[PDB]
Design a protein around this motif. Structure first.
Motif, PDB file in Angstrom:
ATOM      1  N   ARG A  60       0.836  -1.259  -0.072  1.00  0.00           N
ATOM      2  CA  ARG A  60       0.021  -0.170   0.044  1.00  0.00           C
ATOM      3  C   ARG A  60       0.814   1.303  -0.107  1.00  0.00           C
ATOM      4  N   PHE A  61       2.106   1.086   0.447  1.00  0.00           N
ATOM      5  CA  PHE A  61       2.999   2.462   0.652  1.00  0.00           C
ATOM      6  C   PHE A  61       4.145   2.122  -0.274  1.00  0.00           C
ATOM      7  N   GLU A  62       4.787   0.964  -0.296  1.00  0.00           N
ATOM      8  CA  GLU A  62       5.982   0.592  -1.248  1.00  0.00           C
ATOM      9  C   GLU A  62       5.729   0.956  -2.763  1.00  0.00           C
ATOM     10  N   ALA A  63       4.518   0.453  -3.147  1.00  0.00           N
ATOM     11  CA  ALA A  63       4.007   0.358  -4.568  1.00  0.00           C
ATOM     12  C   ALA A  63       2.437   0.639  -4.608  1.00  0.00           C
ATOM     13  N   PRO A  64       2.053   1.999  -4.589  1.00  0.00           N
ATOM     14  CA  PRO A  64       0.706   1.988  -4.333  1.00  0.00           C
ATOM     15  C   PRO A  64      -0.312   1.518  -5.354  1.00  0.00           C
ATOM     16  N   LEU A  65       0.446   1.673  -6.614  1.00  0.00           N
ATOM     17  CA  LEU A  65      -0.446   1.196  -7.935  1.00  0.00           C
ATOM     18  C   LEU A  65      -0.557  -0.315  -7.965  1.00  0.00           C
ATOM     19  N   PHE A  66       0.559  -0.975  -7.474  1.00  0.00           N
ATOM     20  CA  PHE A  66       0.549  -2.283  -7.479  1.00  0.00           C
ATOM     21  C   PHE A  66      -0.313  -2.938  -6.413  1.00  0.00           C
ATOM     22  N   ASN A  67      -0.500  -2.194  -5.180  1.00  0.00           N
ATOM     23  CA  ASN A  67      -1.808  -2.741  -4.316  1.00  0.00           C
ATOM     24  C   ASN A  67      -2.990  -2.192  -4.947  1.00  0.00           C
ATOM     25  N   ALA A  68      -3.160  -1.160  -5.592  1.00  0.00           N
ATOM     26  CA  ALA A  68      -4.454  -0.792  -6.270  1.00  0.00           C
ATOM     27  C   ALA A  68      -4.884  -1.947  -7.398  1.00  0.00           C
ATOM     28  N   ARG A  69      -3.801  -2.785  -7.967  1.00  0.00           N
ATOM     29  CA  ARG A  69      -4.040  -3.773  -8.944  1.00  0.00           C
ATOM     30  C   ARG A  69      -4.388  -4.847  -8.141  1.00  0.00           C
ATOM     31  N   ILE A  70      -3.749  -5.302  -7.053  1.00  0.00           N
ATOM     32  CA  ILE A  70      -4.225  -6.367  -6.183  1.00  0.00           C
ATOM     33  C   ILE A  70      -5.683  -6.203  -5.600  1.00  0.00           C
ATOM     34  N   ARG A  71      -5.914  -4.894  -5.246  1.00  0.00           N
ATOM     35  CA  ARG A  71      -7.331  -4.689  -4.940  1.00  0.00           C
ATOM     36  C   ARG A  71      -8.430  -5.077  -5.830  1.00  0.00           C
ATOM     37  N   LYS A  72      -7.968  -4.496  -6.994  1.00  0.00           N
ATOM     38  CA  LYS A  72      -9.072  -4.781  -8.151  1.00  0.00           C
ATOM     39  C   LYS A  72      -9.241  -6.106  -8.532  1.00  0.00           C
ATOM     40  N   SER A  73      -8.059  -7.027  -8.578  1.00  0.00           N
ATOM     41  CA  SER A  73      -8.181  -8.524  -8.752  1.00  0.00           C
ATOM     42  C   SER A  73      -8.822  -9.012  -7.638  1.00  0.00           C
ATOM     43  N   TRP A  74      -8.659  -8.791  -6.475  1.00  0.00           N
ATOM     44  CA  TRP A  74      -9.234  -9.209  -5.397  1.00  0.00           C
ATOM     45  C   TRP A  74     -10.938  -9.153  -5.535  1.00  0.00           C
ATOM     46  N   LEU A  75     -11.289  -7.944  -5.907  1.00  0.00           N
ATOM     47  CA  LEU A  75     -12.485  -7.497  -5.908  1.00  0.00           C
ATOM     48  C   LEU A  75     -13.178  -8.206  -6.985  1.00  0.00           C
TER      49      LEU A  75
END
Ligand code: SF4
Ligand code: SF4
Ligand code: FES
Ligand SMILES: [Mg+2]
Ligand SMILES: [Zn+2]
Lengths: 208, 689, 48, 114, 85, 124, 96
Positions: free
Chosen positions: B379-394
């Motif tokens: 969420r802080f080291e690579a915010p866009l990577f975390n956003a992609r993970i959240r999108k895939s999760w959802l």
């Protein structure tokens, strides 16, 4: 009544369409296309080497007495292989009409001079050469008309910068006006005004 | 299979479930919209996308109506035009007259769609509605009288950012969007609500009132704040960086950028190095000339050689500068080249790119079935990577498991302890998550590079490689799916590893150098306490944070917005940053500085132009000149075999990421530390309100 | 103006000034904007 | 692909036209120096004509060469008829332009130019 | 005389790099194990021939073309560089 | 009708100075959509623009000065091939960026009310 | 409310003042510096606060078509005055 909309002239549209078919049938060797704009302006697209025959016919024919050359200019479209577009505007006083003839050329392709048909073509072609680099083969006197003596490059091309490359000033060391590379105290500010929403659906191009 | 629909009589084949808006998009017609965003869910409330079907007497919402077989869509029909005019009439009837004092100004969707599809006159003869303005932090300025109640921010907040603090309170004409309490919408993805708001209700506070959209020139560059490599657009005006905007790249950025990327551009205007600096007889730093400074540095370089010459590369250095410095130091047979970030060199080390790269691309997260995060806070080291993970999760019910510290990700995850003992247990097969990985069709193991900064990074790397090997053995060997992944948090780390820099500063600690080139090294890893007495330090950089205070010679360089450069992101993709402005004062390009120094020292480098430098980059590694390509070979078997031969013991310490809070996110690098907006954000998130 | 005096405002000049070109009171142009870039100030204390 | 030629067909006639233009320019330098009251020598003018001819020596297209000689004839007839002034003739020499540095170190010192 | 590093550039799809790819698959691990301190960087080319750069002391580099080489030929060429002949 | 086995090169005829012929790299690209708006009508034609040069502050009035004639020159082409051909015949260096089009997306309003999936929305 | 810099040069309403070491102050030698004495911020602060007993008030700047576009200010936040931003005019509901 629709006071805010320009009225249309279907009679003139039909007359121009009929005359376009007439000239296209008479000159099939050079006429490539005929169009009529919705504001009643006939347009003929011909081969570049048909300039002399087409203009001579449009000037001397009994049913097409275009004795006056209204204007002669060029249009630069760099995205085309033949970027330069030569446009002739002819006026027929006998029939009270106007016609347009359009041809194409590039940098290294000469265009036959129409000075033998219209005399104003002399200075018009001199200006076209000076501003675009289009060469006219049989021109009695082809040279610069508007630009400075020794000016390098053709200003009206789309790839020519607005302020040019050189500027003039008086240098007291040499006691004469000198030419130096251009340098602006305030740079010209480019504005991006194109709206990202399509305005006219009638002219929408296929996605391709 | 595809079904045939008609738009204005033109046939088009569309997949089942396609909406009228998407069919018109395929045929090339863009239906007007206010609430529909392709990245958000479908709302269907602004009613601006109403279109007429040829035989249907009722207009349909194009953004939410699936097409049927043999449907003729009349986009430019009289009913459609009247519907658009009516909806625009309502919106503008309640809207305020704030266009001249509104930052949205010439880039407003309400203005453009009013000019293209609405009427040119107003029949509203009543009083307008005024709404109280809220306060949601120091980044977003809310003037909510201009809100059109399109609920883009609410949907974005919830779905994308995992924060559910936005919503609509009340009902009727008095419906208001807000928090209902004095709560700040502080998140790493908060400026995207500024972007997606079609009106001036949400606007950038740092950018407020500074410029207008038609004045600014757009330069297409990439982001250097983190290792994601987000594609951005720099809006300049009269040679000054005015704004940073996202640029669409569905494999990296996907229309979103982080708050650090968006609002740290004002750190480039403070604490800048503009003139070369030397030390006078009193030991104080004083301005000098390029010739003098380079002559002194060249004299030192001629006097010393061998392992007595070191370079430390920072986090904002380009491939051209790195390769130029590497060649310059190899001219004197010196090899103490290092980066201020540690990667395990045991085994394959930096030899194989599929050992420190993110082998499964960011776009490949959407295809994974199970993901295991080890020692990272995405969420802080690579915010866009975390956003992609959240999108895939959802959108795919992705199962996320986090080993280590329970950081508050924006989605539910299975927590696994805090110690690498669990990491060893999963590899052995005792843990149930081993069975979950075995039964998973597409597993992924992402090890954060911040976990490799520990004393036992090699052991962690060996453990995760063993887990990936066990997954490969149990599951199908066939297939191009890549399991092993490493996530970086430094922009220049991948480029330096590709060029051949030795990761970490352990070599310099082992052999103290006499000459030290700090190339943007503001991490403070090595100081004069570690260095021998009277060591000569040349700090080449653009901000004065640590190296400039502790340096002997200071050489000003160019920022990423100021130089044309090459940066390789965490997944191995190389992208070139273009020039937006020019370096201030006497600052020069980094590779040019290095080349001039070499020429003065007499060991002239063989490149004089950017093309020649990039040819040298191609010679060292062609993937640094293949820009848009991301495909590469897989050498996981070789890497695992080389890792197995030597193993060490894991420490009994919890895996704690260096960044646990949004303040730690805000303060990460030199530009962020020099930024004033980041300081305001830190103060707001610490003190509240 | 005797018949129809102009509207009185507190910010209007009380004394009219003629064209002051060629005099020490002439207008001299200057930039009214601050410095865009602030440069780093090295520490005043020694090191090592 | 066949293209419409301006003149000269192949390259040999283009070279012939280039030589004719060079002779015309060579025989005009003393008259230009005498009429315009230039402070330069005749040798300097001939060398400048040679230099201006030589900067287009890499052209291998007959049509481009034909256009070059056409423009050369134009600028020669401007000089013969005294349509140009001493200003332009001296503009050919760049007598007031400062010497632009060409080495990497000097270019690095002066500014950000490539 | 003192070898500093080795760089092997092989295109992952061209037919001419088939021998080099086989060398990496079945021979690289033993080679790396024998030289733990030698940087042997394997990289990727697009359409050029495979290359074997050898960076020696004081920044001298020799490039050897590995086009259409077999696994044995690559091994012999690499062991010539390590030995010095 | 002569036949020439040569590449088109009108650099000697354009009149551009040798410095601005040799030391210039244009960028052929389709402009990125402005993120502040949802319109996509400015992402259909290829553009050619030159590299940014130095801009300094005028000592008087603090204006933005320049010395690059080709700073404001932007050309529009309907095809990447046309832009490349124009750049090649004019003699400038060029870097080409491939067009980026958004990938197709499956939108479904009924997914907001899923019985067992996470796509269910908590608000409207 | 003009203010004087330590170099003796008056400070404009934008805060402009050449530094002590700046050479550009030579242009003011034997001449003057054009500074406007009336400060808009000071005057608009000197303006009082109008009280109206309504949640929403309208400001057009005075004069009608000679003012600025008409805007509506919502006077619900009792901790601050609602300011018309075209003219910087403060309005407030009657408290107490
Ligand atoms: S949001 Fe748009 S329509 Fe509303 S005031 Fe701002 S520019 Fe005008
Ligand atoms: S604040 Fe903006 S994004 Fe949110 S509902 Fe209002 S108009 Fe839409
Ligand atoms: S775009 Fe469809 S109702 Fe809003
Ligand atoms: Mg907005
Ligand atoms: Zn007002």
């Amino acid at each position: 009544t629709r006071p805010t909309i320009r009225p249309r002239n279907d009679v003139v549209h039909k007359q121009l369409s009929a005359f376009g078919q007439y000239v296209a049938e008479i000159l099939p060797k050079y006429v490539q296309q005929v169009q009529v704009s919705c504001f009643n302006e006939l347009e003929i697209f011909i081969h570049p080497d048909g300039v002399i025959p087409v203009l001579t016919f449009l000037r001397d024919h009994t049913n097409a007495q275009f004795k006056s050359l209204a204007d002669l200019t060029a249009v630069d479209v760099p995205t085309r292989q033949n970027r330069f577009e030569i446009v002739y505007n002819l006026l027929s006083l006998r029939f009270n009409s106007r016609i347009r003839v359009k041809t194409y050329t590039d940098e290294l392709t000469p265009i036959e001079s129409s000075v033998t048909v219209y005399k104003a073509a002399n200075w018009y072609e001199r200006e076209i050469w000076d501003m675009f680099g289009v060469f006219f083969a049989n021109h009695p006197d082809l040279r610069r008309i508007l630009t400075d003596y020794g000016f390098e490059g053709h200003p009206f091309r789309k790839d020519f910068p607005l302020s040019g490359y050189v500027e003039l000033r008086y240098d007291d060391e040499v006691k004469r006006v000198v030419a130096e590379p251009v340098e602006l105290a305030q740079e010209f500010r480019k504005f991006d005004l194109n709206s990202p929403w399509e305005a006219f659906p009638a002219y929408r191009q296929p996605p391709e | 299979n595809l079904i045939e629909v008609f738009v204005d009589g033109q046939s088009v084949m569309v997949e089942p479930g396609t909406t009228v808006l998407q069919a018109c998009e395929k045929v090339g017609m863009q239906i007007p919209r206010f609430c529909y965003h392709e990245r958000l869910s479908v709302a269907g409330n602004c009613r601006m996308c109403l279109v007429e079907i040829e035989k249907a007497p009722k207009v349909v919402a194009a953004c939410a109506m699936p097409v049927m077989k043999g449907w003729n869509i009349l986009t430019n029909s009289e009913k459609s035009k009247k519907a658009r005019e009516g909806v625009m009439e309502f919106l503008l009837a309640n809207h305020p007259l704030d266009c001249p004092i509104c930052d949205q100004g010439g880039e407003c969707d309400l203005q453009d769609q009013s000019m293209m599809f609405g009427s040119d006159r107003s029949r509203f003869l009543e009083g307008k509605r005024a709404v109280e303005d809220k306060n949601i932090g120091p980044l977003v300025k809310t003037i909510m009288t201009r809100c059109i109640q399109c609920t883009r921010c609410i949907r974005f907040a919830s779905e994308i950012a995992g924060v559910d603090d936005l919503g609509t309170t009340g009902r009727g004409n008095d419906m208001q969007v807000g928090t209902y309490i004095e709560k700040m919408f502080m998140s790493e993805l908060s400026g995207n609500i500024i972007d997606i708001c079609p009106v001036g209700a949400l606007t950038s506070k740092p950018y407020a009132f500074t410029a207008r959209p038609w004045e600014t020139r757009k330069t297409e560059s990439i982001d250097v704040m983190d290792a994601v490599g987000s594609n951005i657009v720099v809006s300049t005006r009269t040679g000054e960086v005015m704004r940073i905007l996202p640029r669409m790249h569905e494999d990296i950025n996907e229309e979103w950028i982080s708050d650090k990327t968006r609002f740290a551009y004002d750190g480039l205007k403070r604490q800048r190095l503009t003139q070369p600096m030397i030390r006078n007889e009193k030991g104080l730093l004083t301005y000098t000339t390029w010739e003098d400074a380079l002559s002194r540095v060249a004299g030192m370089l001629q006097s010393f050689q061998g392992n007595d010459v070191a370079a430390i590369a920072g986090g904002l250095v380009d491939a051209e500068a790195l390769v130029a410095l590497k060649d310059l130091l190899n001219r004197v047979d010196s090899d103490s080249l290092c980066t201020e970030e540690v990667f395990p060199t045991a085994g394959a080390g930096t030899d194989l790119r599929s050992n420190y790269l993110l082998n499964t691309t960011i776009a490949g997260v959407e295809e994974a079935d199970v993901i295991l995060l080890v020692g990272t806070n995405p969420r802080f080291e690579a915010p866009l990577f975390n956003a992609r993970i959240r999108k895939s999760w959802l959108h795919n019910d992705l199962k996320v498991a986090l080993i280590g510290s329970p950081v508050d990700l924006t989605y539910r995850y299975d927590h696994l302890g805090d110690s690498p003992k669990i990491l060893q247990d999963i590899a052995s097969g005792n843990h149930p998550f081993s069975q979950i990985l075995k039964e998973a069709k597409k597993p992924m193991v992402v090890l954060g590079s911040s976990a490799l900064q520990r004393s036992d990074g090699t052991a962690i790397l060996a453990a995760v490689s063993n887990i990936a090997q066990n997954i490969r053995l149990s599951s199908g060997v066939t297939g191009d799916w890549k399991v092993m992944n490493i996530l970086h948090r430094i922009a220049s780390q991948v480029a330096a590893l590709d060029l051949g820099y030795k990761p970490g500063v352990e070599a310099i600690r082992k052999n103290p150098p006499k000459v030290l080139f700090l190339l943007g090294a503001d991490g403070g890893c090595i100081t004069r306490q570690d260095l021998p007495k009277d060591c000569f330090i040349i700090y080449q950089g653009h901000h004065g944070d640590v190296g400039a205070p502790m340096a002997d010679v200071i050489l000003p360089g160019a920022a990423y917005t100021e130089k044309s450069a090459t940066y390789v992101n965490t997944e191995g993709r190389a992208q070139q940053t273009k020039v937006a402005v020019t370096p201030p004062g006497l600052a020069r390009e980094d590779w040019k500085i290095i080349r001039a120094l070499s020429e003065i020292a007499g060991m002239t480098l063989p490149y004089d132009t950017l093309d020649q430098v990039r040819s040298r980059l191609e010679e060292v590694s062609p993937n640094l000149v293949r820009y848009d390509d991301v495909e590469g070979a897989n050498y996981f078997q070789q890497a695992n075999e080389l890792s197995k031969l030597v193993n060490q013991q894991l420490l009994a310490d919890p895996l704690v990421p260096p960044q646990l809070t949004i303040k730690d996110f805000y303060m990460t690098d030199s530009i962020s530390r020099a930024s004033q907006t980041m300081a305001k954000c830190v103060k707001a998130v610490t003190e509240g309100i | 103006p005797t018949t129809k005096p102009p509207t009185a405002r507190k910010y209007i000049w009380t004394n009219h000034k003629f064209n002051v070109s060629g005099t020490p009171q002439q207008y001299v142009p200057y930039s009214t904007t601050r410095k865009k870039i602030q440069e780093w100030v090295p520490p005043s204390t020694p090191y090592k | 692909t066949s293209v419409k030629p301006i003149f000269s067909r192949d390259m040999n006639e283009a070279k012939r036209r280039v030589r004719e233009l060079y002779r015309a320019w060579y025989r005009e330098v003393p008259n230009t120096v005498h009429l315009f009251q230039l402070d330069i020598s005749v040798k300097q003018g001939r060398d400048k004509v040679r230099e201006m001819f030589m900067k287009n020596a890499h052209v291998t297209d007959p049509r481009v060469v034909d256009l070059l000689v056409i423009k050369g004839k134009m600028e020669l007839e401007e000089t013969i008829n005294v349509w140009k002034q001493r200003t332009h003739i001296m503009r050919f020499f760049h007598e007031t332009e400062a010497p632009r540095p060409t080495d990497f170190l000097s270019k690095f010192y002066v500014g950000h130019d490539p | 005389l003192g070898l500093r590093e080795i760089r092997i550039h092989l295109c992952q799809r061209s037919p001419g790099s088939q021998g080099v790819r086989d060398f990496i698959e079945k021979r690289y691990v033993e080679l790396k194990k024998a030289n733990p301190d030698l940087p042997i960087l394997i990289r990727e080319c697009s359409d050029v021939q495979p290359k074997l750069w050898a960076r020696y002391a004081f920044g001298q580099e020799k490039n050897v073309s590995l086009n259409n080489f077999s696994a044995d030929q690559v091994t012999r060429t690499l062991e010539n560089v390590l030995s010095g002949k | 009708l002569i036949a020439v086995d040569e590449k088109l090169d009108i650099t000697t005829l354009t009149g551009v100075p040798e410095e601005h012929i040799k030391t210039r790299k244009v960028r052929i690209f389709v402009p990125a959509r402005n993120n502040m708006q949802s319109g996509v009508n400015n992402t259909k034609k290829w553009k050619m623009e030159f590299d940014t040069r130095e801009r300094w502050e005028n000592p008087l009035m603090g204006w933005s000065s320049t010395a690059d004639p080709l700073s404001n020159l932007v050309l529009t082409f309907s095809t990447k091939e046309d832009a490349v051909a124009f750049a090649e015949k004019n003699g400038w260096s060029f870097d080409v960026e491939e067009r980026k089009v958004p990938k197709p997306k499956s939108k479904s309003y009924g997914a907001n009310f899923s019985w067992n999936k996470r796509t269910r929305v908590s608000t409207k | 409310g003009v203010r004087t810099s330590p170099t003796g040069e008056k400070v404009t309403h934008t805060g402009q003042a050449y530094d002590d070491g700046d050479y550009r102050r030579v242009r003011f030698s034997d001449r003057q510096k054009e500074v406007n004495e009336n400060f808009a911020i000071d005057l608009i602060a000197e303006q009082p606060v109008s009280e109206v007993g309504s949640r929403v008030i309208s400001c057009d700047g005075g004069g009608g078509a000679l003012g600025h576009p008409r805007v509506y200010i919502n006077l619900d936040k009792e901790t601050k005055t609602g300011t018309c931003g075209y003219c910087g005019l403060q309005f407030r509901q009657p408290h107490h």
